[PDB]
Amino acid sequence: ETIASELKAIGKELEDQKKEENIQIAKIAKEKFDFLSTFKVGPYDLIDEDIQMKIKRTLYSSLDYKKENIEKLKEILEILKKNSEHYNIIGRLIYHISWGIQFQIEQNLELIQNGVENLSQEESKSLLMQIKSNLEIKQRLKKTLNETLKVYNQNTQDNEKILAEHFNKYYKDFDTLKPAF
């Protein structure tokens, strides 16, 4: 039973994702468009570097580190933050999902660093399967966000049209303005 050989490679696998996201994430730091570094869901929330680190990993990744889309994400978050009823749903995306995913990936990584030999054959199978699920989800998230960006873009868009139409109606000249009464 050489599942060991498999796991050992699946590991060096995601341990690579981490080194290169670490870099891509560092650049964004001095390029000063890393909003997650100061992003709180509610007013007086405490901010843990390590917890935010995981969150940046999964959020900045699904956005291929593209400055623009990151800006757009920040805008969407900001907008939903306005209503307190949206706090919960935002946390699910930010914590239960974006952090939860990297948290899982850490425990998997550890199990391996601890020695795959020290694992049963039953366990060794689960772990591999478990890892695969995580890397599968990591994609669903990337796909999801893209649809989200699509939603926001389409909206900002309709707004543009609407606004422009109005302008051309009323701002052509003094005579296009609304009656004084």
Place this chain on the structure above:
Amino acid sequence: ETIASELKAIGKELEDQKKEENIQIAKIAKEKFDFLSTFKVGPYDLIDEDIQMKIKRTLYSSLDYKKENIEKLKEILEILKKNSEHYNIIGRLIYHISWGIQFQIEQNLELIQNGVENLSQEESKSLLMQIKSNLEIKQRLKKTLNETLKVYNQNTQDNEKILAEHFNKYYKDFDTLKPA
């Protein structure tokens, strides 16, 4: 008849208006939301203090100097700026209209400062009438900016709804995401 007396009064009236806006406008740069100070329509446009002054007068006035609505105006402008096809229409609002209005007022103000006596009787009638039109315009503009913000509010609104339901669909848990 005493049109000269009327003229001279009307001039004191609007010269006061200026004085209070001058204050209210100073305050806004003090609280740092005077976006019109830096605003350019296109990339490399030159910015004249005096021309911007007039523009702030009419735009900040119609909005009633409220920071809430001034912010909203900035957002609308920003949004239309993206497309170059919107440059012209934005200028009409910013220049032809908002500056043009104060420019007219200035020339009227001058005519008076120069001496109403030095004016024909028919000339004096025009001026007075002309002034009145400008004041009316100012209102039509205020009435329109009010609609402009209405529209905007309803939009920001639909967006909110849309966004909120899209989250409470694809983000309840892992199970609710995007399948292959």
